[PDB]
Design a protein around this ligand. Structure first.
Ligand code: HEM
Ligand code: HEM
Ligand code: HEM
Ligand code: HEM
Ligand SMILES: CCCCCCCC(=O)O[C@H](COC(=O)CCCC)COP(=O)([O-])OC[C@@H](O)CO
Ligand SMILES: CCCCCCCC(=O)O[C@H](COC(=O)CCCC)COP(=O)([O-])OC[C@@H](O)CO
Ligand code: SF4
Ligand code: SF4
Ligand code: SF4
Ligand code: SF4
Ligand code: SF4
Ligand code: SF4
Ligand code: F3S
Ligand code: F3S
Ligand code: F3S
Ligand code: F3S
Lengths: 509, 225, 104, 509, 104, 225
């Protein structure tokens, strides 16, 4: 039993509007440099589709995540330590730039400088940001499949259509589409950390954010294959890999991530989750992959349980973090209401960015239909998005937890309609799904009204703990180049001293 | 000629070695962000699996052979490992590794120069260092027919004598090379030159061979610091 | 010296966890300043977009190095009644990209 | 004729409350590091007094500023180039740490950790920030003379009392005191730039801010002596010198300096001044030092003069800068109303931070006095602060310009009182000082109401001009350590590339 | 290379001015980023001081590197009548030093 | 002894020289903020005027003397500047400069070690480098009575021969030193060691002697860049 904390995230796909605002803000702040222009730490994909990079969910092809060997031990799908090292001279599974898209720009200046007497109206043609050469045509982009862009037979190659008779969905009347925004899952059992030969990737103890040390990374580019979500992008210029940093500079002071605060649909929630680090391997190595979801819930600890609280304090968790954990919207959605589910738990990484499945228009039928258990509102069985597709995406193929989430959302709607339209109390739907009026009202508070203070409950990462914040406050930022940052040993060849430190020791004790 | 002889084989080796070491240390302490393998595979995966593996497996074979060949003291298992037996090992095993290395190297150089995406994103140092490695490997293979003229290991004895004198800081190392074929002279100079340029090129990735990974726990967590 | 730090190798090893599946390390993390200094900016200015979208969204315009670098939505609109959701953050993908124009 | 622009500053000493807020904010932002803890880029001094460092105005002692040789040529008082180099092994005029004060801290922790059974109440004693040793007593500080702290005979050593029979001022009834806040003057003919052997100090072309290049400075510490205002402070730890940077990071985007925006008394004004750089030497080398003030005004150009405007555009001054110059409060106070005067123009540096002299309570008299030219309000002749003292401080001993400034301020008061109390128009006082009703009303607008937009009229430094702002916007701040910043030549030993630059050249022209 | 830049010595010399008293140079100024990156911060938060001074001044609290580093006065109080001066910036030396306490 | 002879006088000089040069270049490009004289005068002005001037004027006299003494080819004005005349110049002019240097050096070291403000703010490298300079200067003065035993310049001829062989990269430089007094041996080794440590100490300030100031226009303005 070793308690650690992390700010998890929940995205309500039912409220998702697939606008990509989250992607643009992240891009502007973190990846507008040459080398990562093609990398979208946060990217939104329209489903059905193969995504970015193409077919990233196909682990047989990309070799991401973990496998559970016959002896019960975990091993990266990429191979054990020796197998992985044997692939270092040329990663055989590495995604190529074309699996993402060839980054491009346009010759806008031609519009300004076109010479007098041009035979035709000047135009701005595409040019490659990789070679600087003219591109005859743009054939791919990071969001090429947006809103079912492409023939169904192409989009339907979607890994999540596995075990589903998808023919019926190629019919106009049965058309369906949803949005899947995603970033790094900042896993409890990250496959990236395990597949980096240099040990440059690590999970921060205090807030669970997973980072690639830009000093220590040696550019072995094996981690890219290791990540089953393909959320690590090689910086082709620096020769090192980069990934979503969960906006730690903001999180550290209690602010939401950029993609969370800028989410226009108001579908992202941030809240602390306390977990038992000592149970990570046991949970991730459970025999049946359909048990990974529940096994992970079992690693999450009850923040209102004095036993957990006292253990947390003993393990160094700050009081403000424990407090935040007690009013975590993420804990309520994943643990209490069972509305949020992990993304591909079968990869065995114990992801920390979860999703509430989306509702959808009722399916095509013979007639206009009849009043169901929910009156004029939909019954879970009538939704047009095949539940098996959602289960392949969130619960390793088990439709049970997906149906529960969807039914509970619809139940809340039924209950609230009786209240706001009929002015009556009708808990029939809630009782059918095991929800109390109090739970439905709280669900409504967080999901419908969704006040800012309720969507984001991020505590400080307390940078003052175990460090020296005073000298840092006084001297951080003066980047003159003292050459003494980044090492604990004081000796340095350039005979310098840290600008933000105190060299003259107190002699009065 | 005697002036150049002492310069290249008595003086130059220490200049190259000093630069190699202090340059590596200084770049490690002040250039961590520049310390990378500089993979270009993603930009063009074509032919890399074959080319890079041939080149690296070959070059590593050469390294192991060169290391034990020139640095192992004669008295160690002298009876079982006489100089002429070591030479045969070098010629056949080293020769084979050299062929793998050269083929891989040439394929990689062809790629770096003519694959638009790689050529457009390369640094001059990448082209220079690989070109010198290809030339050095070729020079090495070319010494084989010369070594073949002295299967009694006489030539190798001279070369090993020089190498050992240099690494143990014994002056007069160049005298060991008296009469050795010129081809060996060239190979040694280009070889030392590679050490000189080493810290200012991508070769620094060699220092980072991930040995610790083989016994490291899978999950890494960093505490507040 | 980062080179000398390598010698504190095993000395920086903390407790293992998850029955040997993990290792807690006590090593330098100063490199993290690299992304912190990118987020840092000179000031934020309130502005909006003179485009025909009907959005009328207020944004925080970030100035860094004396130049406009990016924008994120303001979230301080006067709140609506307790029984209604509030307007924040508003915004859209088009608006989030406006900063691109200034020196494009 | 070469026009350049600069944001000058004017401090209204008549509104000065000597609060030091300006000093604290500057300190917190720029000089809280070990090495410069004793340095106050902005410091406030109470006069009469010797200041910080002690007796800084005594150039015979400190050797600051310029001298005009018999042949009419200018030379740093420190010596010509050879003379200065001959002093490099040990600057004979260098101010010692004790001339400032020995920086100290206190052992606050003793209050927390004092052991049980202490014989007396624990206390926090002083400790040196230079040696870390216990200090028996604090004997000096940067503001030791605050509010006439010290015997008159000590304070009166004040250089500005030269040529004044000061005995009468030692009498209680004749007591007087004023405040002199100051920073670097960012001179047009800086003595610091001229006395640095490495050429590390320079004046920025676009905004006239004077800076010490932290890369290029070699720590010759000669500039410290060169500056007659002693506004350059040696960083004893880094071994390099630092000085007020006029908050260029803020000015660059059009914001006021920290000390300007945080000035509680609302006495600081920021406005552009256009000057003819080609006339700098001619003006600074005028024979009579009492002519330096007017000679400098002659270097300032009329921003509303189309001749100047067209020349400015030809010389590269941005349109927004010219516009700002046309509504500059600094230009109005220095050029139009003649209220602002330079600080010690006799140093021949052509300072750019000017001051409006302070009014004061009437002097001691035989009776309660009679109505004067200004009615119940003071006449300039009755002010208690000796005008000769103010002239020694601002006009090289010439009382004429000081009397004009003071009289005009009093005239505005007389005119406004007639208006607001008697409800009548009385321009008698204005006519006597050559002011029109319009000028008095504008003076009132800027000095009395002093709206924020009127106190600070700072244009952008336009960082996009002659540079590449696009790649900078996208990649500035990612301080991973590319080792390619600070040089124009691309070659670098670590075989790296700039993070905020584009390496892949366009091949489409 | 800064070392190689030294060779562009005379090449970086522009026009002289003031009859030879001055020289305009065209040299690198990247070092200026050193002070720019100190001013840059994570965010500003509005707060005031719970001390018995009667000031009641609103301040901008600067957070940098996830820590409180300094403060400067807010200047956005509702403006007073046109015939009266406004309240901004308010503040005092005591208040300007409060940030010192947090990690002191 | 012959092994150590070749190491210190044939090998070591090139290690020290390589480190001196590449170390200076690397620190200049990646350590501009650390490139300073590191004045400590403000913290304690007492005795600095006398101490620093004596030390610097003395050390510069030694530098000029050593530079022209060992690097000037014999054929240059050979008739007017025979070796024994150069030796007399070195003994008297160099000796005088050495005395000024040593006195200044000792005073500076006494200050750095016992003046609380200076000692409390010093770096270990400052104490080490000054201590070695004081020792080296003393060693130098101590060679004078040995040179006095050979006023015909025989000893100086050996030392100059060695120095010139080293700087022109002519192998066998150590042979020139045959029979020279041991004191000279020590002086040379410590001297070269100072070059080795040079780039990692405050001595880098020497590279920056402000020559350009003597002819520079007074006012400097930097354009947008
Ligand atoms: C076991 C030790 C080594 C490892 C793990 C290693 C790994 C790598 C990797 C991952 C790359 C990037 C390949 C890509 O583009 O994806 C690379 C490139 C390279 N390595 Fe190594 N390397 C090792 C030893 C060496 C040695 C001993 C040499 C020669 C002295 C060498 C020379 C090169 C060269 C020249 C390249 C760039 C090829 C090109 O031009 O594309 N490597 N190495
Ligand atoms: C300072 C570095 C090097 C030194 C001193 C060196 C020395 C030698 C010597 C003495 C031989 C002849 C072996 C004998 O006497 O039987 C040899 C052969 C050879 N070397 Fe090198 N070498 C160096 C670097 C390299 C490099 C970097 C490469 C690859 C690019 C290389 C490739 C070869 C090959 C292919 C042969 C011939 C077969 C063998 O003996 O392995 N050498 N080298
Ligand atoms: C003309 C060239 C030189 C100039 C302009 C120069 C200038 C300086 C300056 C300004 C200081 C700081 C003094 C202070 O504390 O205020 C200093 C210190 C020092 N210099 Fe030089 N220097 C020169 C040459 C040399 C040489 C050739 C050496 C010896 C190889 C040397 C050795 C030292 C040492 C050891 C110190 C520090 C003394 C201490 O421990 O306080 N300098 N120099
Ligand atoms: C690599 C560096 C150095 C070399 C090769 C060197 C070499 C010599 C030689 C050969 C002599 C005897 C002159 C003769 O033959 O008449 C000498 C003398 C001397 N050296 Fe050095 N020296 C070095 C550095 C220094 C330094 C750094 C100092 C001061 C701290 C110094 C101070 C002296 C003094 C005082 C003398 C005696 C009088 C004279 O000949 O100037 N030397 N040195
Ligand atoms: C004598 C000065 C040597 C400077 C070497 C610079 C490089 C460096 O330390 O690379 C290291 C190997 O070198 C030594 O430890 C050698 C011992 C000295 C002879 C590797 O550093 P690294 O940060 O790449 O480690 C990554 C680990 O994951 C490797 O298992
Ligand atoms: C061979 C590699 C040499 C690296 C030297 C590093 C130092 C450096 O350049 O210092 C410089 C002098 O050295 C040369 O130019 C020497 C030519 C090479 C033999 C001085 O650099 P600096 O920035 O101190 O200049 C300041 C000027 O104001 C001096 O007038
Ligand atoms: S989602 Fe993030 S933490 Fe999880 S394996 Fe991928 S990169 Fe690592
Ligand atoms: S958490 Fe931050 S870095 Fe990660 S995707 Fe969101 S905005 Fe990008
Ligand atoms: S963010 Fe989008 S919707 Fe809002 S104002 Fe801007 S362009 Fe319009
Ligand atoms: S006041 Fe400023 S610009 Fe003028 S001489 Fe002093 S430091 Fe230089
Ligand atoms: S202008 Fe800026 S740096 Fe200068 S004194 Fe004012 S606050 Fe300090
Ligand atoms: S700034 Fe001063 S007056 Fe204002 S609230 Fe703070 S302590 Fe009070
Ligand atoms: S494998 Fe490791 S070395 Fe870097 S490229 Fe990935 S983090
Ligand atoms: S797609 Fe739009 S709804 Fe939120 S998750 Fe992204 S901003
Ligand atoms: S003299 Fe120049 S070298 Fe630095 S200490 Fe002053 S700016
Ligand atoms: S003393 Fe106070 S009045 Fe302004 S100039 Fe400084 S804040």
């Amino acid at each position: 039993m070793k308690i650690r904390s992390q700010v998890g995230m929940v995205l309500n796909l039912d409220k998702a509007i697939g606008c990509h605002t989250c992607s643009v803000t992240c891009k502007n702040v973190w990846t507008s440099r040459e080398g990562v222009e093609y990398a979208w730490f946060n990217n939104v994909e329209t489903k059905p589709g193969q995504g970015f990079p193409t077919d990233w969910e196909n682990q047989e092809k990309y070799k991401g995540g973990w496998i559970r060997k016959i002896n019960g031990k975990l091993q990266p799908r990429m191979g054990n330590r020796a197998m992985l090292l044997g692939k270092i001279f040329a990663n055989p599974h590495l995604p190529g730039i074309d699996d993402y898209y060839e980054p491009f720009d346009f010759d806008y200046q031609n519009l300004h400088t076109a010479p007098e007497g041009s035979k035709s109206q000047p135009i701005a043609r595409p040019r490659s940001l990789i070679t600087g050469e003219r591109m005859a045509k743009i054939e791919k982009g990071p969001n090429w499949e947006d809103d079912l862009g492409g023939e169904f037979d192409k989009l339907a190659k979607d890994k999540n259509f596995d075990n589903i008779q998808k023919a019926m969905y190629s019919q106009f009347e049965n058309t369906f589409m949803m949005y899947l925004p995603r970033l790094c899952e900042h896993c409890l059992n990250p496959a990236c950390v395990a597949t980096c030969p240099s040990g440059a990737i690590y999970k921060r103890e205090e807030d669970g954010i997973v980072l690639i040390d830009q000093d220590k990374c040696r550019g072995w580019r094996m981690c890219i294959t290791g990540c089953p979500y393909k959320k690590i992008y090689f910086n082709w210029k620096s020769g090192k890999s980069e990934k979503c940093i969960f906006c730690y500079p903001r999180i550290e002071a209690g602010q939401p991530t950029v993609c969370s605060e800028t989410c226009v649909g108001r579908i992202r929630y941030l809240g602390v989750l306390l977990y038992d680090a000592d149970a990570i391997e046991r949970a991730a190595s459970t025999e049946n992959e359909k048990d990974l979801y529940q096994r992970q819930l079992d690693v999450f600890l009850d923040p209102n349980d004095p036993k957990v609280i006292e253990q947390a304090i003993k393990d160094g968790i700050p009081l403000s973090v424990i407090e935040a954990a007690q009013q975590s919207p993420v804990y309520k959605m994943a643990m209490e209401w069972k509305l949020a589910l992990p993304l591909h738990p079968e990869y065995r990484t114990l992801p920390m960015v979860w999703y509430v499945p989306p509702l959808s228009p009722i399916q095509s039928a013979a007639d206009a239909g009849e009043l169901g258990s929910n009156g004029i509102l939909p019954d879970v069985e009538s939704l047009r998005i095949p539940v098996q597709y959602l289960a392949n995406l969130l619960t390793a193929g088990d439709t049970k937890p997906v149906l529960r989430a969807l039914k509970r959302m619809l139940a809340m709607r039924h209950y609230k309609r009786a209240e706001t339209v009929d002015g009556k109390v009708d808990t029939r739907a809630l009782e059918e799904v095991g929800l109390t009026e109090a739970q439905a009202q709280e669900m409504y508070r967080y999901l419908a009204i969704a006040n800012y203070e309720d969507r984001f409950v991020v505590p400080s990462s307390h940078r003052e703990l175990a460090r020296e914040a005073f000298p840092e406050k006084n001297g951080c930022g003066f980047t003159f180049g003292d050459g003494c940052h980044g090492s604990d040993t004081k000796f340095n060849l350039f005979n310098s001293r840290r600008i933000d430190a105190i060299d003259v020791t107190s002699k009065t004790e | 000629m005697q002036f150049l002889n002492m310069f290249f084989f008595d003086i130059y080796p220490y200049i190259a070695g000093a630069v190699f070491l202090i340059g590596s240390w200084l770049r490690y302490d002040y250039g961590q962000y520049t310390w990378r393998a500089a993979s270009s595979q993603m930009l063009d995966r074509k032919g890399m699996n074959l080319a890079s593996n041939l080149f690296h497996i070959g070059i590593l074979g050469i390294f192991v052979g060169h290391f034990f060949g020139m640095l192992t003291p004669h008295w160690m298992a002298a009876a079982w490992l006489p100089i002429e037996v070591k030479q045969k090992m070098a010629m056949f095993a080293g020769g084979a590794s050299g062929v793998l290395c050269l083929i891989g190297g040439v394929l990689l150089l062809k790629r770096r120069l003519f694959s638009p995406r790689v050529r457009a994103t390369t640094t001059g140092a990448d082209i220079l260092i690989l070109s010198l490695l290809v030339i050095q490997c070729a020079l090495g293979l070319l010494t084989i027919p010369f070594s073949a003229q002295h299967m009694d290991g006489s030539e190798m004895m001279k070369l090993v004598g020089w190498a050992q004198s240099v690494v143990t800081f014994h002056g007069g190392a160049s005298q060991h090379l008296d009469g050795v074929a010129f081809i060996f002279r060239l190979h040694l100079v280009l070889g030392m030159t590679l050490f000189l340029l080493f810290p200012f090129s991508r070769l620094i990735h060699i220092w980072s061979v991930p040995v610790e990974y083989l016994t490291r726990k899978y999950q890494l967590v960093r505490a507040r610091h | 010296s980062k080179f000398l730090d390598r010698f504190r190798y095993a000395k920086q090893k903390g407790e293992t966890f998850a029955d040997g599946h993990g290792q807690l390390l006590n090593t330098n993390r100063d490199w993290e300043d690299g992304y912190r200094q990118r987020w840092q900016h000179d000031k934020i200015v309130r502005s909006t977009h003179g485009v025909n979208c009907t959005g009328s969204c207020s944004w925080k315009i970030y100035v860094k190095n004396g130049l406009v670098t990016w924008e994120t939505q303001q979230t301080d609109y006067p709140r609506t009644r307790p029984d209604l959701p509030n307007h924040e953050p508003r915004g859209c993908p088009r608006g989030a990209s406006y900063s691109w124009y200034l020196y494009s």
